Amino acid sequence: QNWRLLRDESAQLRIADVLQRKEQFRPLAKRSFIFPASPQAVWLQVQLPAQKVPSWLWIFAPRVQYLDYYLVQDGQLVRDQHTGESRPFQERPLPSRSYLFSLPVDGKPMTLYVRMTSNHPLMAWFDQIDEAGLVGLE
Ligand SMILES: [NH3+]C[C@H](O)c1ccc(O)c(O)c1
């Protein structure tokens, strides 16, 4: 698959450092994970073909303190957004307090990198959704 993960036990790898280790990402048997409380960073990588309709990456990450989001196209970082529960504000309209990232329609594929860290268990679910899913989030 293209929904891949990477465990950073040092927690020091950055976006450049992670893009220098693309061959260490490994396929996920499912679209979620959970890890007991540790100071490890969990990096998710998603390669998508060219998109034809407006869509969003949804991530329900309860108890997740820091979450950094990076988007890669033509070897460039087009978007770089840092948020998280430990991050303040970031208010958005989902009762769930879930996360959504718009996925562009620009005639090129894309690679997503997401870093998650916490002092609690690293529960997380994620998927790509269209408008049929967007209108039903809570
Ligand atoms: N849709 C995102 C939502 O506003 C939000 C904001 C900050 C958070 O720490 C979070 O989990 C969710």
Ligand 1, closest atom to CA 87? 9
Provide the experimental method for this PDB entry.
X-ray
- Computed on alpha carbons and rounded to an integer, the radius of gyration of the chain in Å comes to 14
Cα distance between residue 84 and residue 67, in whole Å: 5
Residue 94 near ligand 1, beta carbon < 6 Å: yes
Strand ranges across the sheet with 99-103: 32-33, 124-129, 55-60, 99-103
- Cα 98 to ligand 1 centroid, rounded to whole Å: 6
Q: What is the resolution of this structure in A?
A: 3.5
Residue 134 near ligand 1, beta carbon < 6 Å: no
CA distances from 79 to 9, 11, 18, 35, 52 (A): 26, 22, 16, 27, 19
Tokens 């679910």 appear where?
125
* Structural contact between residues 48 and 107, judged by C-beta atoms closer than 8 angstroms: no
What's 108's domain CATH number? Answer: 2.60.40.2380
Q: Residue 130 belongs to what domain range?
A: 3-134
- Cα 33 to ligand 1 centroid, rounded to whole Å: 19
A 10 A CB-CB count for 87 gives 12
Give the tokens for residue 128: 């790509």
- The greatest distance separating any two alpha carbons of the chain, rounded to the nearest whole angstrom, comes to 40
Number of domains in the chain: 1
- Cα 87 to ligand 1 centroid, rounded to whole Å: 9
3-state SS of the chain is: CCEEEEEECCCCCCHHHHHCCHHHCEECCCCEECCCCCCCEEEEEEEECCCCCCEEEEEECCCCCEEEEEEEECCEEEEEEEECCCCCCCCCCCCCCCEEEEECCCCCCEEEEEEEECCCCCCEEEEEECHHHHCCCC
Cα distance between residue 98 and residue 116, in whole Å: 14
* Structural contact between residues 99 and 58, judged by C-beta atoms closer than 8 angstroms: yes
